[PDB]
Amino acid sequence: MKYILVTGGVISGIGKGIIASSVGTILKSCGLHVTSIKIDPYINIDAGTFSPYEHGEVFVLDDGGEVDLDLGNYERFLDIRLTKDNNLTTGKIYQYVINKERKGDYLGKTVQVVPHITDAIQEWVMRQALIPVDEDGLEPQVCVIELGGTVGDIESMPFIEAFRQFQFKVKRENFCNIHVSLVPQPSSTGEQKTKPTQNSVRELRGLGLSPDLVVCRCSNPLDTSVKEKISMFCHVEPEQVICVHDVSSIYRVPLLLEEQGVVDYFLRRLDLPLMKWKEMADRYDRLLETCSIALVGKYDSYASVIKALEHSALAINHKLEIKYIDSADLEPITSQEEPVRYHEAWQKLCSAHGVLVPGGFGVRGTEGKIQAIAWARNQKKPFLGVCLGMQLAVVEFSRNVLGWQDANSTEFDPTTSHPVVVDMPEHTMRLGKRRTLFQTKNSVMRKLYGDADYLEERHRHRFEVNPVWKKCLLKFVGQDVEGERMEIVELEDHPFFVGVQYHPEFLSRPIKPSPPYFGLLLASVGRLSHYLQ
Amino acid sequence: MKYILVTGGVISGIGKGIIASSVGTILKSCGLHVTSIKIDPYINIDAGTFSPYEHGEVFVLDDGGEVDLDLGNYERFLDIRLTKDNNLTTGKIYQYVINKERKGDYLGKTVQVVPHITDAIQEWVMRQALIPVDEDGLEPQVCVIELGGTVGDIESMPFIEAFRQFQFKVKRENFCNIHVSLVPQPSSTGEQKTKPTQNSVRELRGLGLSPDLVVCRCSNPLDTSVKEKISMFCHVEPEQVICVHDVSSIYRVPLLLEEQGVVDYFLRRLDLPLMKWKEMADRYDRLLETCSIALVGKYDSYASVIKALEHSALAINHKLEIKYIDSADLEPITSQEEPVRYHEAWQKLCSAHGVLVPGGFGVRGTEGKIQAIAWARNQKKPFLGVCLGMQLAVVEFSRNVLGWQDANSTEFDPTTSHPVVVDMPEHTMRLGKRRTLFQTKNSVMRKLYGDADYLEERHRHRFEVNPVWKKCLLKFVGQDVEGERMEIVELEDHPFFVGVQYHPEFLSRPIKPSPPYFGLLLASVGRLSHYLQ
Amino acid sequence: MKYILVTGGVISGIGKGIIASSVGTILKSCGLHVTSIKIDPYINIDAGTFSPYEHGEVFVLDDGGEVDLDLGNYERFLDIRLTKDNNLTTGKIYQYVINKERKGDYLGKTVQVVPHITDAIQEWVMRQALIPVDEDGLEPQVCVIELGGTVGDIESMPFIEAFRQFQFKVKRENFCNIHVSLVPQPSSTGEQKTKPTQNSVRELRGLGLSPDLVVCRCSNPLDTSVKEKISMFCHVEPEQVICVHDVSSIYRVPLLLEEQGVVDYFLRRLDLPLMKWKEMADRYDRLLETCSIALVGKYDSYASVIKALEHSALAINHKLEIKYIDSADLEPITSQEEPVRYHEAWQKLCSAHGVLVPGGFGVRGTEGKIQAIAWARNQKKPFLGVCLGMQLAVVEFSRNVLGWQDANSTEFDPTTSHPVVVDMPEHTMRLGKRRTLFQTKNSVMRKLYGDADYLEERHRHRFEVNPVWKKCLLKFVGQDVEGERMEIVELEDHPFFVGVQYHPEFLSRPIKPSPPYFGLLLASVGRLSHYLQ
Ligand SMILES: CC(C)(C(=O)Nc1ccc(-c2cncc(C(F)(F)F)n2)cn1)c1csc(NS(=O)(=O)C2CC2)n1
Ligand SMILES: CC(C)(C(=O)Nc1ccc(-c2cncc(C(F)(F)F)n2)cn1)c1csc(NS(=O)(=O)C2CC2)n1
Ligand SMILES: CC(C)(C(=O)Nc1ccc(-c2cncc(C(F)(F)F)n2)cn1)c1csc(NS(=O)(=O)C2CC2)n1
Ligand SMILES: O=c1ccn([C@@H]2O[C@H](COP(=O)(O)OP(=O)(O)OP(=O)(O)O)[C@@H](O)[C@H]2O)c(=O)[nH]1
Ligand SMILES: O=c1ccn([C@@H]2O[C@H](COP(=O)(O)OP(=O)(O)OP(=O)(O)O)[C@@H](O)[C@H]2O)c(=O)[nH]1
């Protein structure tokens, strides 16, 4: 079992998780079984507590683990499905050591960061690397470990100290370190300034790790002079200095790393035994005709959602132009306070070829979602409602077709006489992979799902369609195995108007877009009726 | 005597010397006498040894000190003239302590960095601050000390350790620290990333200095959220967090700092007792008509030269478009190897309204300077030759008017039968402020110099017009006090064709452009004959 | 050429130079040619400027280099004779780079600590290691480099950074690092506290060197538990953790290191191709009868002097008890101010079996030296005067035999009518190895020097016997080659009363004591008249 530690230098956000995922897909293209671990240096046990503006888009695993979006990048670059504990955190590891101490497992010895926390990190990394997360049950050959944050943060110090030991616990042929840095090119200077990379490598070596690769996040490509200054002051070979510059599509980043020789490096360095990504890149860069989706949302918070639309767009062979609409601008109160916000949002929503109402929590902007769904019903615009979008598609059909004008969920208005979507916990949240049964053949969604009698999809919600009001409601084509819970709704006498109670986007891959996002893209270009035919 | 230490964070080149100079001109606008010290953490005693690609444009002081371009920024933002030792270096300070040790002045004690080098830095800073560098002999009230490099470099550590002591030697009301940092805004992220500023302030506090001001070099203005994150993690008041964003003209940087409240801060913080810069900025931003100068040079290396043209441009009320021409592209051999380089250079040189041949050293590109001067003579283009440009204007007039086709300097071709410019050392280099006498009234240069019988200008050259060949040569209107050395040449029967043996640009200020650069700008827009009239 | 860097941890003074010398004599016992370099992180060029209380006993090399006492430990543990530049300092290396910069050798580039000073250190270390300092002209196989100071001092950082590069310039088989630390055992705690060693190794690894050996300066031997805690937290093998505890004699320190396995370690670790020290130790520890020497001195400052007496003592097979007498206590003014100091000093001087007046500078205590020599003449006590002791033996014979009661040197009393020892510079100081000729056979000193017609000895003085007054003066048996300078004086009609103008102690080795120190030891036990017979 080989390990690659990806570490971040000057700043976060510089594509380190894309580099980690690209290194993984490169090694998978070498025929290796590859797993991945994200370390997030935060005290939070799971991302499920986060407001989607900080560590945006909590990605939901099969087991119900609410984790960082980087775990979703791993599942998209590599055909793996991960477990909760592939997201390591200081909360998870300190709680482990604390509970272990309270049980007496440390045998009356003083517990402390070195060794006991640094051992716990190594134990965890070894354990999770041996788990066959891959699409078939084969034991992984390499684990790409991404350390979040930046080096020399007080939060990252335990993990770097653990990896400093780890490279002597496993042999050097089993441990590589990549340092992903920034080389800024200021307006103030015109030069590509390597100084912060040099200081960050110096800092990392002060913590006892020496970069085997220095991967520079550049905007423009590195000059030779700057690369030789990096090689010099980072005390490493020129071949081991890489530029990841700005590129047109995500699909080029493995190819850029391939060109830069990292594959050949890893093969020799770790003693180890992608033409689709050329194709997808070249295909992307020659898309002329454009679809347009209105994303009517509250909240990067739509990372998986956007990616699922781009997969779908590339599959139908169109560009995508996503009309990001703040749902709080489609509310009639924004017509009072800011008529410029109100009319620009409705220009965007009307010019859109279809509309997507994504999931979320809280009242704020829900009435703007309900008005965006009303537009999409009555003007026959292709509609996808995801999680909350299904719940509010049942509220909108209740208000403006059934005439139950009071109707809402018990999340927002528990005082309502028509609680058409109700708090319905698992006898907790309906969270992770559940099986949905198709209750019929009469579904376009069933046809898009390949005419299977069931599907299994990742859920993350507390509320469901009320089974009393269901009798008056809007064909609930997908149900749970108990028949208790409605999980797909499809409206009769519309081109495509779907609510799904799960999150389709978490299972979208470039090679296989999720069928409701594909159906939305197909319908909003009029190709769905050809596809189903 | 008050001290302000300006320190650099993430990178160099982020306008720290402009910030230091702006802080100085702000305090001078408060009516204070202000001096400045640049510390360059390099082992070099003086910049006179540098190739102009590294620490480009060696600025020459009155005393003959060859120093960094930042000393020239101090002389341009503040009407001061500095001494050699206002450029402090590790070479100057270690050589001081070493020579002092060899003389036994440390009384048989072991000399070491702390205290003896850190004392020497403090001694130097106090001594040079008491020197009246200002336009009248009044003792300075504040010294702006700029520390070059970045904090936590092994070179900068002695100086930061010295300043850590200094703030307890002089009282806190006599010592302020400004930290000039970078807040990058990546294409990869869209966010303004404060992390490297936080780490740099943390690093600086590890070296025992706490930022009184954190000045963020931004591209775009700081968001409130980012400023509050800086104030938090740098543990300082929001009012003490400043953004210096990108602005149109240099003239706005004091005004931006003024708006950001730093003047009011310094006045209270140091217990101390610019409308022209509004004017110059607004004047600059509304210039419509453009002059164009061909800068036919070898080598930022033309920093003072460019600034002198921009002063002149703003004074005549035109824009400037500088046609940077690599002199090595005007050589006929570049017509052989790269005819695209050769013709683009001659398009630039012919479309130019006048030509400037700046100073320099070595053969490389001199034949391209000689061909650019030949163009400027015979096509009656306004010409300024500076230092080497005068020497080569005497070579060109010798080759193509006198027919001495062999002619060159003894620097390039010592074997020549017509050594028309010869190695003529000071009985060393002719370096620093010398007095030139005007040998006549018949000079446009004398009229531009206000009809004075002499001028005093900063020289930096080893070679001079041969007094033998002078008799055959091209009116040498300016001579030294000995009559040994020709120091201005002016050609008869041309609009404006001047060689000066000194560097006029080192004495250019926004409020007073140097007369040959002004005369070139005036002549290349046809206004000179009105100005002299 | 192999390198061993010895580095110091918690404090200086913890026997690091004895460890370095012991490692050298171990490798020399393996049949290797071994050289040594001391790095002193101080700004001083040479130790010749020091007051003997700081870096006490300036050791004088053949070339006239005045260096630290550790260079003398190298010459005593290994039969080598060193050059000036085997003492490296920051003064020597910064002056090198500065002078090299002023000559333009750095080609207009910015000189800075990394690379240019760190390169200069590596250049120096390589150059001085190739010099055959050994007793025959064979090129060294290993250089033991001792870094003075402690790790993580701002002074030591350039050298550790140089060695961090050096281990990748030469291969790992050519570079070993030993870390000599302290393990304190407080009265407050009873435990041996490894924490400062762990922190010092952590600090050293932050500077990029990892201990190949951790040598603990212990008082008492390490416990197993403490050694295993060191091995753990210093992340190194138990076999690579060594205790150098307190031992009876210096002769045991190589044997202790041998027992601890370091020889076997170095042989494998550096891929390389002492029974006298058992003997000398066992011989020392069974010495019963004692000689006693009065050391009547001003000033560790007598390190070489003490060692030369101990060599002599071990050779005659007696113990030595050195009566350290502050010469300022034998002055009659101390009878006025402190009669307890005055009488204790004269009890010590009278109970002594012989007296040694060592070299020194300045008036202070010279009248106490003159009174100690007066005692030794007239009471027929065996006397050795070294350098200043010869000069003052000519002053004392002038005052109290010739009756020139005014007599002194021109150093102390230039106004004197009998300047019997005069300032006589080299047409500078008479410094380093000079040849002395014996002007006769009638000398006990010539017999002790093996009946050679000349000797060559290390001098360090500015003053000499006046050749005018010489005619009235006390047989000057040793002269320089010019006959200008008297260099041995021997008094007729006394058991043994010798002045030497050189320093015999710098050439004393355990296997060969210097003959005047041996003659003093022999005479003060009455064995000299048997030895010469
Ligand atoms: C949104 C879109 C269209 C895309 O091309 N985005 C894009 C483009 C360029 C970069 C980029 C540019 N330079 C440097 C770096 C880095 F490497 F340094 F970070 N990145 C990042 N993201 C897309 C479709 S599918 C997807 N992502 S995905 O579903 O995970 C799939 C891969 C498995 N994104
Ligand atoms: C060349 C030109 C026309 C100029 O406007 N340049 C320019 C413009 C903007 C900035 C700038 C933008 N944002 C931020 C910062 C910083 F503060 F963060 F660095 N700077 C820097 N330089 C000029 C004329 S005169 C001169 N300079 S000068 O002769 O010394 C005189 C002042 C005394 N330059
Ligand atoms: C003065 C005397 C009698 C002596 O035994 N001293 C003594 C004794 C023990 C230690 C000692 C105890 N524990 C630990 C460590 C260390 F290793 F950790 F430092 N040292 C140090 N010095 C002596 C004679 S000859 C000489 N020295 S010498 O001429 O250079 C010759 C060797 C070539 N000294
Ligand atoms: O203002 C000054 C004065 C002196 N120096 C000194 O000159 C050296 C120049 O070094 P830089 O700071 O330019 O760093 P670099 O070349 O290693 O990296 P980038 O430019 O690519 O970011 C520094 O390390 C410092 O010792 C300055 O950088 N700037
Ligand atoms: O990938 C991950 C995982 C975890 N974390 C953790 O979350 C914290 C988020 O902090 P950031 O790294 O975003 O830093 P910041 O907000 O102080 O500064 P800028 O964004 O303006 O540059 C970090 O300090 C680290 O502890 C990440 O940053 N990224």
Ligand SMILES: O=c1ccn([C@@H]2O[C@H](COP(=O)(O)OP(=O)(O)OP(=O)(O)O)[C@@H](O)[C@H]2O)c(=O)[nH]1
């Ligand atoms: O007062 C306290 C409280 C807590 N601790 C904690 O317990 C740990 C005990 O560790 P020590 O400080 O005893 O260090 P050590 O055993 O590594 O080394 P020596 O004793 O040989 O010097 C420390 O590292 C700290 O985390 C104390 O040491 N002391």
Ligand SMILES: NC(=O)CC[C@H](N)C(=O)O
């Ligand atoms: N995942 C979501 O979109 C949440 C929807 C809704 N708030 C619920 O809890 O069911």
Ligand SMILES: NC(=O)CC[C@H](N)C(=O)O
């Ligand atoms: N300052 C310059 O332009 C130098 C010109 C020429 N090389 C000289 O030494 O005179």
Ligand SMILES: NC(=O)CC[C@H](N)C(=O)O
């Ligand atoms: N080495 C010494 O003892 C110095 C003796 C005397 N001061 C001289 O200079 O000669």
Ligand SMILES: [Mg+2]
């Ligand atoms: Mg640089």
Ligand SMILES: [Mg+2]
């Ligand atoms: Mg952040």
Ligand SMILES: [Mg+2]
């Ligand atoms: Mg302990």
